[PDB]
Amino acid sequence: SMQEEDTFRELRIFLRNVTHRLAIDKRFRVFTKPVDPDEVPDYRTVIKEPMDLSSVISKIDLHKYLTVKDYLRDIDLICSNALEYNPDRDPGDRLIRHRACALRDTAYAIIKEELDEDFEQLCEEIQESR
Ligand SMILES: COCCN1C(=O)N[C@@](CCO)(Cc2ccc(F)cc2)C1=O
């Protein structure tokens, strides 16, 4: 229905706002663009499913996310890709892992504080019905 399409547009507007707040945070600058194959050719071979905040904005605009649960899976992937590719005892690696964990924790805390559980439940029920 038109009503359900309005509900999904509402969800996309909220997801664009959360993603913009993460992308302007100086800590998360490394997560704002895909890894440049020139600089890191080792990456696309170690990392099977690359994800960054620019690509998240792309997935929202293409209607790939119908639930907050769907969105958070891609946040979790940004974080899990950084921890798996930078596991070394080495300050540079420790710094990116701390920032990746802070990105994940921030996104979960915004959604916990701001979004009503009944709105997510609604978005899920429309998804399941299709
Ligand atoms: C927006 O769509 C979901 C409906 N909704 C919520 O889930 N929490 C609030 C308030 C509780 O009523 C607040 C809020 C407003 C705008 C948002 F983008 C996000 C959250 C709300 O208005």
Side-chain angles (χ1 to χ4, degrees), residues 1-25 27-130:
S1 69
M2 192 75 262
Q3 301 95 248
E4 294 174 328
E5 286 321 311
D6 285 347
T7 297
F8 288 136
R9 184 150 182 271
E10 198 171 5
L11 165 71
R12 296 193 292 274
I13 293 159
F14 177 60
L15 296 184
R16 284 196 202 94
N17 182 261
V18 177
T19 309
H20 184 251
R21 282 145 74 193
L22 302 172
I24 68 178
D25 191 311
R27 290 175 295 171
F28 307 145
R29 182 173 186 280
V30 69
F31 310 118
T32 61
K33 298 184 292 181
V35 173
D36 185 355
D38 285 1
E39 299 166 47
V40 199
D42 179 24
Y43 198 67
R44 231 140 237 82
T45 80
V46 185
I47 304 305
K48 298 302 123 193
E49 198 181 1
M51 191 51 65
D52 65 277
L53 296 169
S54 189
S55 298
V56 175
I57 294 287
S58 295
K59 288 189 62 164
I60 294 161
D61 291 349
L62 292 160
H63 301 200
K64 305 279 193 180
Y65 307 116
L66 272 72
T67 75
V68 181
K69 200 187 249 94
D70 292 358
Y71 171 84
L72 286 174
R73 279 197 252 287
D74 277 350
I75 296 306
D76 290 335
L77 180 56
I78 290 173
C79 185
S80 65
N81 291 352
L83 302 199
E84 283 166 27
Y85 194 65
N86 307 271
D88 298 5
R89 219 267 167 212
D90 165 71
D93 280 22
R94 295 170 67 171
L95 180 61
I96 194 154
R97 291 198 300 278
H98 195 266
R99 291 171 164 181
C101 290
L103 175 83
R104 181 201 63 201
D105 288 352
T106 297
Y108 275 80
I110 287 170
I111 282 152
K112 182 183 185 178
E113 289 192 312
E114 289 178 30
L115 197 71
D116 201 307
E117 66 172 337
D118 286 358
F119 183 83
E120 171 59 357
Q121 186 71 28
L122 170 56
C123 285
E124 289 190 27
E125 282 183 6
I126 304 167
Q127 174 177 70
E128 177 51 30
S129 86
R130 301 209 166 176

